[PDB]
Design a protein around this nucleic acid. Sequence first.
RNA 1: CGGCCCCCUGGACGAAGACUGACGCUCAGGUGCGAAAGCGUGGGGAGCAAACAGGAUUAGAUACCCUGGUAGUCCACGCCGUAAACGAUGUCGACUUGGAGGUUGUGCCCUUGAGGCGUGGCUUCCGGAGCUAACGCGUUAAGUCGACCGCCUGGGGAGUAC
Lengths: 70, 166, 232, 240
Amino acid sequence: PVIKVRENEPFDVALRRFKRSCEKAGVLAEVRRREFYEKPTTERKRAKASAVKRHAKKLARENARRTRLY
Amino acid sequence: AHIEKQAGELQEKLIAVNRVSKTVKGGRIFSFTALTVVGDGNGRVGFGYGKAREVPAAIQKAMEKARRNMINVALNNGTLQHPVKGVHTGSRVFMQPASEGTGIIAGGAMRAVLEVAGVHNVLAKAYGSTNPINVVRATIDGLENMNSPEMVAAKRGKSVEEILGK
Amino acid sequence: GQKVHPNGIRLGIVKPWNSTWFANTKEFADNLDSDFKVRQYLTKELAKASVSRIVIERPAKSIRVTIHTARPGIVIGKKGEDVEKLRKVVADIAGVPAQINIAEVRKPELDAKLVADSITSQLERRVMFRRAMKRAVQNAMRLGAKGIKVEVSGRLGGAEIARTEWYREGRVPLHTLRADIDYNTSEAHTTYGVIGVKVWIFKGEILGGMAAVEQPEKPAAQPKKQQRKGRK
Amino acid sequence: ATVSMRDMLKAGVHFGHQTRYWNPKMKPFIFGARNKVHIINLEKTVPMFNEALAELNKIASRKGKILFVGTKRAASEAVKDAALSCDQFFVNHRWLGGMLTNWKTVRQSIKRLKDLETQSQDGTFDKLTKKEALMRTRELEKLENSLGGIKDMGGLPDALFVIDADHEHIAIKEANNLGIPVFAIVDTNSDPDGVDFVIPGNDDAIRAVTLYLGAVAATVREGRSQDLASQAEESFVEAE
RNA sequence: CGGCCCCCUGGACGAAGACUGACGCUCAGGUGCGAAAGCGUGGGGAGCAAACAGGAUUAGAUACCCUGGUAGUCCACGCCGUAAACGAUGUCGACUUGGAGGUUGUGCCCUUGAGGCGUGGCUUCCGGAGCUAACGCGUUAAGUCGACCGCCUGGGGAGUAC
């Protein structure tokens, strides 16, 4: 999992951000772990789930203008 | 206090008293809690669960909440004709119009909570939890819509009120 | 149950000592034990009066009692026989003849031992204590001061457990060195044993009832103060 | 008064924004978005604007006291101006929670302020350490900034003057429990619900928010002014 | 229910033209139909694994944990259809402020940005009336209701006994 997609300009440290798009996730991540059939649909596919903390933050920005904390 | 009826002097019917404390990190809570009903014989919603450090202060706090922001309820002393199918937090009541010639039997304090409410003749046995705190709540949810008509034009009665909104 | 005793660090500045005399080391124990005996046996006689403090003082060839009271007339009794009997026994205990004065009475309703006799009476007399702690506090704050603490112990209601209760209201400093501030711990008996109230009351952060002397050394005494600087 | 159609229009052609979110109970006064920009509906607003302004002229002779609440970084200079003078009270260094319900208390701490201000100027609290005296000067500055436009208020107000409700809901809640009529200016994310009169608006555009409050403020303040004049006019007619 | 195709083919979502005209709701009994392993014969078998064995723990059961290691897991047809069987939210239908996300029939637009409005579609965020013990639900209800059916009536002992 140095990830086959080549890093822009080659260097001794791999640019792990610039490389992954959908590798390792779900396929080679749960190594030495119990495989489930249908749990992965709700267990791993968490892109909506992780957006909510960013939204919460983008809401509280506005309120800090109205409170005069900002 | 604020919107309350032409009560004159206080009902000071204290229904329960407690003291509650966690003692987990630094001793007890010294405060008491109090449950008090304040009416006037003529129909009120006045009911207060409040709390403060000592028993005199507990009652007066509780009574202050029995007396602020409490609607007038416009019943004929101990008779009521238009009660409500009372629900408050699983504690269920179903009063209905009824004579004052037949009396009221009710255990404990219940004729006394009911007496200052004016709903003592219409009351019929409660259901759900018979926990002393919520069992007495007849006079709150059970009085929100009402009348006690004395008018001869009761049989026109919604009509007269309807043609005025036109 | 914490703290070095709250009035005890205050004893060197703006709080007076409870006794003031000096004996040159070797006779200091003999004077301290007599100063105790006058405290113990004299107060036994005035049992029926009400009193806030006892202050014992020893000039040359004399012992002066100061006593601080709920009123000026209370210790004197009918036609001064009573106050002579007090001086009689102060003269019998002490290696000298005796003087007694009653002080000027100032804040006797807010004073350390007289406010605590008023509060101890409720517990002594086995009243319900449903409203007591609030009526004690109501009257201290109605007659004066700036803050009060009361702590009551001795198994309230007759209990077979340790049982304490307390009340603080206003301002009550604890680690302050300046002004007099009044504390008393009462001891008293009832049917079931000994009861006791610990009472801090706080009158003011500046109090002039004991204050430093009028002058420094440098302006005081003789007008021509400079030395010859030898020349015997 | 005739004012009410010119103020609402001048202000309102900003059409707001607040992205496409908004609040459903405000929906009647909202036209549908024009390519991910929010648009006001003004025509349903013309009944609302006139009604509030006619009732404000009327209470002018009955009231002693207005209170300007709902301050923000954008609303403060409009909160200072609308009061114009001290029969009309305002906060711009924050509203604090409970300023009306515990008015008993607020009035005790104001008495601590106008006392300890005349004291600081004689020099009286500067004693002990300089730290103990500067640390008092700094809490006195904060108290002073917070209270500076409400220090003479003799009682609970006759009305509540709200310039946005979005974040200041407790002040309104209590004012209704004291039975005080609230005169509201709401943004799109605000609800018109649960207060007595609305000027439906939006919180963006500095030119809109200034105009809503000036329309609402002018009617009651110069209304009051006219109540005062009529007393003058009664003696004077005989020699006129 | 997830590789891609072909053959047979269900069910739901739209839309115009058009037709019938209560032909409707619910469903005991009922017949059909399995997540999972269980499982009979045939086919298939690569790894992994209950047990089993031994180490390791002392922490006890060969368990846990690690290494060896088998039935099993896998397909086809077939037998009693089990559970936390799911939005533990019955069915279908009528009524109740809405905006917007995901994304799609389709009316309109330079489709000014998984964009905007008209009107259907499942799917979801927010919150109002109502509803809750409380979290929560809220136009896809756990609201207002409709009929009809299904099931529950203190714990332990019993999902066993009969």
